[PDB]
Design a protein around this nucleic acid. Structure first.
Ligand code: NA
Ligand code: NA
Length: 327
DNA sequence: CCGACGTCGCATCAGC
DNA sequence: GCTGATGCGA
DNA sequence: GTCGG
């Protein structure tokens, strides 16, 4: 379905979503508008009325009403008003800085700090994460062409193997499903020495090596199992330098790795279908394990998993390529 | 009518 | 100083 | 805000 079909409506709903999350701090209303915006974007007909839209799951009385107003007038009074509101639109905007959520954005705007300019003038009020978000504001809102992702992967797989050739690393996200572009890079790392039942050094050494070859440029957060940071392809010769990119790296015990890989490969929709399909066969799959219910409903021990396919086998489902995992 | 609605690792705050 | 809560991102 | 026990 094309944008032209219901884009005005889904744009409206997504904007309303953002104000709920960032200004009203009503996360569930945020998810409500987003789900409605999704089911509408997938709807293969130009919507003619709110009543028509209400047939869709996630679309209730109040959104039907708003769709009516939008159809008859080409706008929404409430949205027009909040757009023009100096406080609210500023709060909503500041949250586009990574590390600035609804609560921090609220406080800044309370003390008069409203713009990137104002943030720039008030560095000492920013935490480390927020400074990095501000520094790379523009870069972080850019997408990553698959070709750059491949080049990023080259470096990541290369430097990981160089640290220890027994590491296993997998770049997941939409990239692994074959997307033409990506929002960031999500890397899953395991090692034969790290299981559930078993150093608190394995992640640090990989981060270190990627910083040594100047791939990783900044650190948002870093513990023993999760790294969140910034990276950058080297500039080719004398050419225009690449944007800085968001990269996450997480260390998962070997026995939970492929549950990890499956889960962080997605898509979101596929994971739920699969996870329902799922319960029906009598098994329980979170991001870590698969476990059998359980005649009353008592989940038993985590089953052995040694590939993605192993999981599919358990629930009598035929292995499916990442490319065929949009749902 | 009224509660559910991803969850969890890390950084930092709030309180002791 | 430590422990638990809160904010944040994904 | 929407769904449903
Ligand atoms: Na509906
Ligand atoms: Na933000």
């Amino acid at each position: 379905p094309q944008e032209t079909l219901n884009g005005g409506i889904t744009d409206m709903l997504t904007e309303l979503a953002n104000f709920e999350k960032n200004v009203s701090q009503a996360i569930h209303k945020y998810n409500a508008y987003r789900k409605a915006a999704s089911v509408i974007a997938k709807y293969p007909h130009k919507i003619k009325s709110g009543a028509e839209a209400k047939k869709l799951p996630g679309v209730g009385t109040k959104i039907a009403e708003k769709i009516d107003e939008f159809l008859a007038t080409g706008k929404l009074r409430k949205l027009e008003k909040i757009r023009q509101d100096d406080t609210s639109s500023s709060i909503n905007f500041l949250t586009r800085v990574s590390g600035i959520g609804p609560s921090a954005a609220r406080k800044f705007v309370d003390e008069g700090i409203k713009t990137l300019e104002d943030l720039r003038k008030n560095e000492d009020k920013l935490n480390h994460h927020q400074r990095i978000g501000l520094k790379y504001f523009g870069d972080f809102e850019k997408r990553i062409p698959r070709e750059e992702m491949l080049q990023m992967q080259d470096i990541v797989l290369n430097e990981v193997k160089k640290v220890d050739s027994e590491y296993i690393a997998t770049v997941c996200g939409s990239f692994r499903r074959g997307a033409e572009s990506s929002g960031d890079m999500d890397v899953l790392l395991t090692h034969p020495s790290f299981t559930s039942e078993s150093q608190p050094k394995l992640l640090h050494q990989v981060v270190e090596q990627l910083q040594k070859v100047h791939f990783i440029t900044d650190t948002l957060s870093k513990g023993e199992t999760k790294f969140m940071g910034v990276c950058q392809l080297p500039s080719k010769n004398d050419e225009k330098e690449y944007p800085h990119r968001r990269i996450d790296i997480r260390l998962i015990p070997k026995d939970q790795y492929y549950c990890g890989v499956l889960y962080f490969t997605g898509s979101d929709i596929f994971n739920k279908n699969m996870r329902a399909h799922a319960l029906e066969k009598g098994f329980t799959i979170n991001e870590y394990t698969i476990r059998p219910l359980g005649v009353t409903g008592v989940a038993g021990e985590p089953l052995p998993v040694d590939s993605e396919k192993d999981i599919f086998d358990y629930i009598q489902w035929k292995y499916r390529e990442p490319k065929d995992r949009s749902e």
